[PDB]
Each structure stands twice: as C-alpha cells, then as structure tokens.
Design a protein around this ligand. Structure first.
Ligand SMILES: *C(=O)c1ccc(-c2ccc(C(=O)OCC)cn2)nc1
Ligand SMILES: *NNC(=O)c1ccc(-c2ccc(C(N)=O)cn2)nc1
Ligand SMILES: Cc1cccc(C)c1
Ligand SMILES: Cc1ccccc1C
Ligand SMILES: Cc1ccccc1C
Length: 9
C-alpha cells in the first residue's frame, strides 16, 4: 500500500 501511494514521488 505504501508503495502504491508513494509512486507519486
Ligand atoms: C503497497 O503498496 C505494497 C505493499 C507491499 C508490497 C510488496 C511487494 C513485493 C513484496 C515481495 O517481493 O515480497 C517478497 C517477500 C512484498 N510486498 N507492495 C506494495
Ligand atoms: N515517485 N517515484 C519516482 O519518481 C520514481 C521513478 C523511478 C524510480 C526508479 C527506481 C528504480 C529503477 C530501476 N531501474 O531499478 C528505475 N526507476 N523510482 C522512483
Ligand atoms: C514507490 C516509491 C517511490 C519512492 C520511494 C519508495 C521507497 C517507493
Ligand atoms: C518492489 C518495490 C516496491 C517499491 C519500490 C521499489 C521496489 C523494488
Ligand atoms: C522496496 C525496495 C526493495 C528493494 C530495493 C529497494 C527498494 C526501495
């Protein structure tokens, strides 16, 4: 999940 959201970065 963290990665899925942090892809913006
Ligand atoms: C959320 O964005 C998220 C959580 C966990 C994972 C993930 C990807 C790959 C592995 C892996 O290769 O584990 C080997 C033990 C684990 N967790 N991706 C995205
Ligand atoms: N928000 N994330 C990014 O902007 C981002 C773009 C690209 C990459 C990345 C990481 C690793 C590789 C590789 N070939 O191992 C390529 N691109 N990370 C983050
Ligand atoms: C998806 C992603 C972007 C930036 C940094 C990390 C660790 C993960
Ligand atoms: C499996 C994974 C997830 C998020 C960022 C980098 C990598 C190698
Ligand atoms: C999540 C991950 C896995 C393997 C190498 C680098 C990174 C950021």
């Amino acid at each position: 999940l963290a990665a899925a959201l942090m892809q913006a970065l």
